[PDB]
Amino acid sequence: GELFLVGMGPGDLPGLTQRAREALEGAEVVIGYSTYVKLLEEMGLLAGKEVVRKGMTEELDRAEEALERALSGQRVALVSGGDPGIYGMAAPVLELMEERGLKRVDGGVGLPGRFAGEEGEVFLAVIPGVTAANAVASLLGSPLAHDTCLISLSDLLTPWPLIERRLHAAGQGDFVVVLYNPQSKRRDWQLRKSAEILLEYRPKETPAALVKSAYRKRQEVALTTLEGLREAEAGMLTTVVIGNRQSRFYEGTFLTPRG
């Protein structure tokens, strides 16, 4: 069967690539987390297709569901917000295929590729999409105009000590920092802690920003400073951007110099 991991971009119809539109068009079954599936449903892109979102809350369940359906011979589209390879479905799917002992049967390298196992075969492809970092940057100015680090604050499946390590490294290397999954329930202090770590490498007045629901309804852009981040509140659909030692604000824009 076919299994296409389709990156949706930030969330609006214009945000998808034609390649993503085409992948959805050819899919017989579309799988993804409720919120994303509904966005596509509202766009009117899932008419006449089997839509699967019930019981798709868990990352692993979505991957297993999509893989078993593809192995059975269905043309599946597993949707991800932004890009599937950035804290998305690409990794869970490959890890599951590896676990199931699927082997490449076309002699190729990378993807797309055809794989097969005792339980069938699957043509796997990843359709890229605009990731949150680039999407929120377009709503800020040129914050990522220089070397950037992408870090997820989702301690889920990743030790906080390591995240601290990633933050110190990003801090000492003077990288612009983009925080994915900035705030949680279990640990409502991670954002503040992240800011304090970075504060040891760059000024309090270092430009920072919290962009919520980029390109979606209730989109919100909030400019602040690294120091201000210590008391900031972030949602589940928020991406935080922290400038480097050269970043500065220019007439409302977050400007990170090219040189």
Ligand X SMILES: Nc1ncnc2c1ncn2[C@@H]1O[C@H](CSCC[C@H](N)C(=O)O)[C@@H](O)[C@H]1O
* Cβ proximity of 203 and 176 under 8 Å: no
**8, burial (CB in 10 Å: exposed 0-12, middle 13-18, buried 19+):** buried
Nearer to ligand X, 136 or 191 (CB): 136
CB of 118 to ligand X, least distance (A): 31
According to the binding rule CB under 8 A, does residue 129 interact with a copy of itself? yes
* Cβ proximity of 198 and 167 under 8 Å: yes
What mask, x for binding a copy of itself by CB under 8 A, covers residues 146 to 165? Answer: xxxxxxx----xx---x--x
In whole angstroms, give the CA distance from residue 153 to residue 194: 9
60 backbone φψ class: left, alpha, beta (φ>0; ψ -120 to 50): alpha
Q: Which of residues 67-86 bind ligand X (CB under 6 A)?
A: 80-83, 86
Q: Which of residues 6-25 bind a copy of itself (CB under 8 A)?
A: 7, 9-10, 12-19, 21-22
In whole angstroms, give the CA distance from residue 12 to residue 228: 30
According to the binding rule CB under 8 A, does residue 97 interact with a copy of itself? yes
According to the binding rule CB under 6 A, does residue 254 interact with ligand X? no
CA distances from 226 to 177, 205, 208, 210, 239 (A): 11, 6, 6, 11, 14
259 DSSP 8-state letter: -
Q: Which of residues 110-129 bind ligand X (CB under 6 A)?
A: none
Nearer to ligand X, 71 or 90 (CB): 90
According to the binding rule CB under 6 A, does residue 52 interact with ligand X? no
Determine the interface stretch with a copy of itself among 44-52, 69-77, 85-93, 183-191 (rule: CB under 8 A): 85-93
Nearer to ligand X, 29 or 214 (CB): 214
